[PDB]
Amino acid sequence: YDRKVPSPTGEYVKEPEWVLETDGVNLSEVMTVPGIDPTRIYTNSFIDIMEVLGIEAGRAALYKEVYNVIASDGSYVNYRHMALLVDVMTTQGGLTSVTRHGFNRSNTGALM
Amino acid sequence: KAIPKDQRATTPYMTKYERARILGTRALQISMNAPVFVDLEGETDPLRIAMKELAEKKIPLVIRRYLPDGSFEDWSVEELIVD
Amino acid sequence: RLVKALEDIMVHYDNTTRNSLGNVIQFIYGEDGMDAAHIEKQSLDTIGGSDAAFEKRYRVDLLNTDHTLDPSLLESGSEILGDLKLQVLLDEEYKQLVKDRKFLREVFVDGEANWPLPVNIRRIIQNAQQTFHIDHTKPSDLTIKDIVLGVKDLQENLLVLRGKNEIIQNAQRDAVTLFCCLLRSRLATRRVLQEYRLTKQAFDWVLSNIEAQFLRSVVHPGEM
Amino acid sequence: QENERNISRLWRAFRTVKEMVKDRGYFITQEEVELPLEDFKAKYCDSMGRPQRKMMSFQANPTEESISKFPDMGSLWVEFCDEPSVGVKTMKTFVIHIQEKNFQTGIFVYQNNITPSAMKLVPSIPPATIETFNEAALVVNITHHELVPKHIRLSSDEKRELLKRYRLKESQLPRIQRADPVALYLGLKRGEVVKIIRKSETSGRYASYRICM
């Protein structure tokens, strides 16, 4: 994978590096192993990021997951809308489902 | 509970919703034989007369902006900077 | 599911996105307070370019011959050279641009300079040059204190929150930091005296247009 | 072999402990955290090679700024354990030791697991608390990750000022669970507001305010 890193000449330079793609998931164990950066690691399952790295990491990871499908479709959506959506799913702590069990199980008025 | 004039911390600019409802209510009053404060240039449509009064700030109204805590402010449409 | 999921969410008359029950989702709509109908893709001139181009552009020396100022650019160029005060102001502006470059290095780690931001400065500059008949080989009547103090006085005029407390001004500065960095990047002494060759009425007109369009790019409270 | 690797993991975990206590507001110098592995092995390891976690237990003292901001903040006592399964008697020695030394808070680190009776014998001395952390969980500091922004624990006056300027109730703020490894990292309690400084890509510096459950 090419990585844009700043050169001491004032502009970024693509510097390829070997990166390990992985099938299956186990974040906690992999993080503790010596020989890798414990400060860098990603998971396609945002749930594990929430559990291990906490609520803020769960938020950012959720935003990345949503943004990914958008960019994959070949479409552009403004930052505002996605940010609002992500925030709503995280304002009660943890991850909140968008379901009929995800906002009809919390008070908003009986009619709503 | 009516915030005083020295503590009004809302936007002094008139929004599109405030201009819309001011032109709609003012035009509705003009359609119902309201005293016009501006000399007409030959207009017949009430909305054009309402916009003519808004262009010179002769509309005698004041907006009660509701705050989320239950309070409100009184920003007269004459002191509101349009556009 | 999306429509019925996001419905009772709006922005009240305090520039804070909160639902009907009062639960605050975002303290500022879009984390900037700008509507999605006045944002245009802009380029950040602070991170773009090499170090030799950065120091070649943002250094206007008066007591040194490394990055000296060409006196033929402005009418009073023979009197600007040798001034210590304007050189100190250029030092403060240059240090501010360097701090903005480190900040942009920490914010955007991918290296991209194109990001959506309000207010198009290029169209204002072109409208000023085509309006005031600003052509090449024309000495300008501006100085260093007019551009530096003009930008510094324009940075205080940018207002999104109408408060006066500590947290309100902190959120205002943290919500205007990037745009102020863009204005400090596009509004340099070398970029105006060398390339643009703007005059007094043209520069003041550009300032009034930037402040005006910034006051029109604010999101309106009450929009769903 | 396995001994040197366990010494390395215990050294990185101990460094994470010093970083966590330093982030709480206790006086630990930078050179004390940046202590190399050879010195740690040259201090807390016997002639045979096995580390001594009983000697690694130390005391933490709050900084002057932490006392100036939080006048009710007291000292801390950090202990470890050489037993794989922490018994109830060791926890009794820890609680009685805290009660004798009169510490406001306490941190006990275990290796594998602790008996449920000890976990039940934790909220026994109010208003003092005891933080039980795992040795395998504190190997990597979660605050040094890129997806984790900066958190600052506020006070009571700043909380009332925030709720007064924003005109909010305590329930109207975004809530954060106690089970958060960040909340356990900072040692948050019920009714404490924290500030989250994050680097957004549309404003440069975005601030948020959360409150524990």
XYZ file of C-alpha atoms in Angstrom, chain D residues 39-142:
104
model
C 16.764 -0.239 33.865
C 13.373 -1.698 34.814
C 14.902 -5.178 34.654
C 17.894 -3.786 36.569
C 15.529 -2.560 39.320
C 12.515 -4.871 39.757
C 14.052 -8.220 38.734
C 15.954 -10.540 41.057
C 19.252 -12.282 40.333
C 17.394 -15.266 38.863
C 15.434 -13.136 36.396
C 11.860 -13.198 37.662
C 10.249 -9.772 38.177
C 8.966 -8.669 41.578
C 5.573 -6.971 41.301
C 5.439 -6.399 45.069
C 8.358 -3.976 44.709
C 6.673 -2.305 41.714
C 3.861 -1.056 43.971
C 4.332 2.684 44.471
C 2.543 5.867 45.539
C 1.229 8.699 43.364
C 0.979 12.315 44.506
C -1.247 14.864 42.725
C 0.227 17.888 40.996
C -0.146 21.461 42.215
C -2.439 22.315 39.296
C -4.640 19.296 40.042
C -5.002 20.419 43.663
C -5.666 24.001 42.547
C -8.418 22.823 40.183
C -9.684 19.886 42.302
C -9.194 20.741 46.000
C -10.871 17.451 47.006
C -8.335 15.379 45.038
C -6.101 13.185 47.188
C -3.118 10.915 46.737
C -3.143 7.477 45.109
C -1.692 4.068 45.982
C -0.811 1.660 43.158
C -0.261 -2.041 43.861
C 0.122 -5.178 41.761
C -0.066 -8.905 42.535
C 2.232 -11.907 42.119
C -0.616 -14.419 42.449
C -2.210 -15.613 39.180
C -5.661 -15.806 40.814
C -6.159 -12.986 43.318
C -7.660 -14.391 46.503
C -9.955 -12.659 48.951
C -7.251 -12.331 51.627
C -4.980 -10.284 49.353
C -7.890 -7.967 48.548
C -8.548 -7.660 52.285
C -4.909 -6.651 52.782
C -5.321 -4.095 49.983
C -8.512 -2.567 51.409
C -7.227 -2.545 54.997
C -3.937 -1.080 53.757
C -5.786 1.720 51.948
C -7.872 2.391 55.063
C -4.708 2.579 57.180
C -2.788 4.838 54.787
C -5.925 6.982 54.225
C -5.942 7.267 50.437
C -8.858 8.753 48.520
C -8.563 6.320 45.592
C -6.848 3.021 44.882
C -5.696 0.986 41.894
C -5.232 -2.795 42.041
C -3.895 -4.692 39.018
C -4.458 -8.444 38.700
C -2.885 -11.015 36.388
C -5.636 -13.463 35.364
C -8.843 -13.172 37.420
C -10.132 -12.287 40.883
C -12.645 -14.144 43.028
C -16.166 -12.640 43.007
C -16.091 -12.115 46.783
C -13.246 -9.613 46.395
C -15.081 -7.741 43.630
C -18.031 -7.608 46.030
C -15.712 -6.272 48.763
C -14.847 -3.100 46.828
C -17.624 -0.505 47.661
C -17.061 -0.979 51.399
C -15.224 2.235 52.354
C -17.004 5.408 51.063
C -16.246 7.705 49.474
C -13.063 5.867 48.499
C -12.983 3.777 45.327
C -10.858 0.903 44.026
C -10.029 0.451 40.330
C -9.448 -3.171 39.290
C -7.507 -3.386 36.017
C -6.099 -6.396 34.183
C -2.414 -6.852 33.403
C -3.249 -8.115 29.903
C -5.631 -5.181 29.336
C -3.156 -2.420 30.263
C -0.515 -3.652 27.800
C -1.336 -0.910 25.268
C -2.503 2.597 26.127
C -5.727 3.309 24.247
